[PDB]
């Protein structure tokens, strides 16, 4: 039969996750949309980074969610979006995480410079250079996501490999290569940049206390530190189970895979990817809570 590819997650849990996804879609899409409109100097250079983040969030909510919600949560087989939709999906997902992880570190660097060397940053990097750096990050992010264009692909996992219902989107490379391509992503998009940003966020948090006479600059910095602090924490917590599941996918041996671990993996998949869409919806919520100037103008642009 062609039931060997059926994923047996109960109907109730599917509805539960769908309700969560749809809610995070509404919160996330609206959140990041009027965030871009709100953004449209140092307060302004930071605007390009926040704008770059909101873009990486809109892409994953508009393009990745409706694809995943259909072919990964409800209808597991067959894959309906072609080979390009298979390769482009995992490409877009990896590229955005790199873009986000690099933006956080970039903000951590620039915020450090705004506190420790405010005169060195007085003759700051031109609006043009910051925009070039935003573009460079995106392109570098795409280069790092290249392996996904070759690691992923369409396979027919039916009995004889002939039945259309067995056409699924799955890694098409050997298990050894897959471990390597997953490791590189886990290191470069998660472990490495977050460890750096955490160290920077530790230094800034201490340096800020050390510093504490014309403008209300110190209030703006405090906003800058705590938002960034929350973003790093929110990024780590959300993406940690995600990377574990991917390692779990390829490091568990074939003789080790039972019917329990199979079903556990797919319920785990729901939770890990739910936190992914939380990560792409939390930022506009974070901006509103702390910055008093931003939240009111946010709601004013929301009515408009």
């Amino acid at each position: 039969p062609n039931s060997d590819l059926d994923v047996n997650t109960d109907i109730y849990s599917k509805v539960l996750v769908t309700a969560i996804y749809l809610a995070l879609f509404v919160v996330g899409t609206v959140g990041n949309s009027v965030t871009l409109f709100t953004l449209a100097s140092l307060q302004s250079t930071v605007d390009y980074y926040l704008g770059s983040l909101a873009l990486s969030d809109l892409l994953i909510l508009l393009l990745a969610m409706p694809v995943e919600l259909y072919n990964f949560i409800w209808v597991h087989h067959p894959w309906a979006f072609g080979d390009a939709g298979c390769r482009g999906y995992y490409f877009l997902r990896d590229a955005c995480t790199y873009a986000t992880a690099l933006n956080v570190v970039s903000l951590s660097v620039e915020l450090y410079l705004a506190i420790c060397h405010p005169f060195k940053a007085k003759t700051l990097m031109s609006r043009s250079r910051t925009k070039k750096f935003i573009s460079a990050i995106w392109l570098a992010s795409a280069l790092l996501a290249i392996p996904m264009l070759f690691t992923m692909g369409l396979q027919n996992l039916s009995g004889d490999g002939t039945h259309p219902g067995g056409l699924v989107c799955t890694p098409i490379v050997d298990t050894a290569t897959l471990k390597v391509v997953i490791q590189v992503n886990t290191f470069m998009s998660f472990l490495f940049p977050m460890l750096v940003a955490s160290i920077l966020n530790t230094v800034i948090a201490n340096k800020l206390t050390v510093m504490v006479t014309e403008p209300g600059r110190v209030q703006a910095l405090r906003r800058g530190v705590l938002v960034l602090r929350a973003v790093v924490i929110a990024f780590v917590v959300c993406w940690l189970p995600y990377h574990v599941r991917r390692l779990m996918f390829c490091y568990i041996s074939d003789e080790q895979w039972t019917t329990f671990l199979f079903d556990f993996y797919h319920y785990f998949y729901m939770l890990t990817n739910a936190l992914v869409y939380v990560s792409a919806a939390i930022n506009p919520i974070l901006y509103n809570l702390v910055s008093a100037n931003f939240r009111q103008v946010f709601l004013s642009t929301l009515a408009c």
Partner: peptide, 8 residues
Amino acid sequence: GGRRPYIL
């Protein structure tokens, strides 16, 4: 021994 997930 048993089934392995094909979804990543």
